[PDB]
Design an enzyme around this catalytic site. Sequence first.
Site, PDB file in Angstrom:
ATOM      1  N   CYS A  15     -45.824 -63.742  18.334  1.00  0.00           N
ATOM      2  CA  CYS A  15     -44.548 -62.996  18.412  1.00  0.00           C
ATOM      3  C   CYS A  15     -44.257 -62.457  17.051  1.00  0.00           C
ATOM      4  O   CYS A  15     -43.624 -63.095  16.214  1.00  0.00           O
ATOM      5  CB  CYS A  15     -43.440 -63.915  18.935  1.00  0.00           C
ATOM      6  SG  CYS A  15     -41.976 -62.924  19.297  1.00  0.00           S
ATOM      7  N   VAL A  16     -44.866 -61.305  16.812  1.00  0.00           N
ATOM      8  CA  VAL A  16     -44.959 -60.606  15.535  1.00  0.00           C
ATOM      9  C   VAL A  16     -44.768 -59.119  15.633  1.00  0.00           C
ATOM     10  O   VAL A  16     -44.939 -58.607  16.731  1.00  0.00           O
ATOM     11  CB  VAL A  16     -46.373 -60.852  14.947  1.00  0.00           C
ATOM     12  CG1 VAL A  16     -46.636 -62.356  14.817  1.00  0.00           C
ATOM     13  CG2 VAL A  16     -47.504 -60.258  15.818  1.00  0.00           C
TER      14      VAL A  16
END
Length: 114
Positions: free
Chosen positions: A113-114
């Site tokens: 989750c970037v």
Amino acid sequence: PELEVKGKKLRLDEDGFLQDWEEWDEEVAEALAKDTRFSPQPIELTEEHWKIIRYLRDYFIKYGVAPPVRMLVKHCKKEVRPDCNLQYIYKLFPQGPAKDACRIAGLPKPTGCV
């Protein structure tokens, strides 16, 4: 660490993520949202929060990993508000999409989750 929800002693990691991810449900999400051990700004989960949490959880069950922030923004634009952006995601989830949204959605890690 532990999180006790409806009689169940659920395992968290030291960042607050649910290791027993298969035990998640909406009451566990609420407990995670209010878990001040892992956030100095506990959250009220509004309809807008719940649209994001549902997307994130569904993505993780289907695809096996957290979605990138790009995909979260793409969803927030269609289903929350067309002007959604990273500022708005952080207004909803003050520690950000990884530390807060993935955590509250019951993912075991924020990986990806970037």
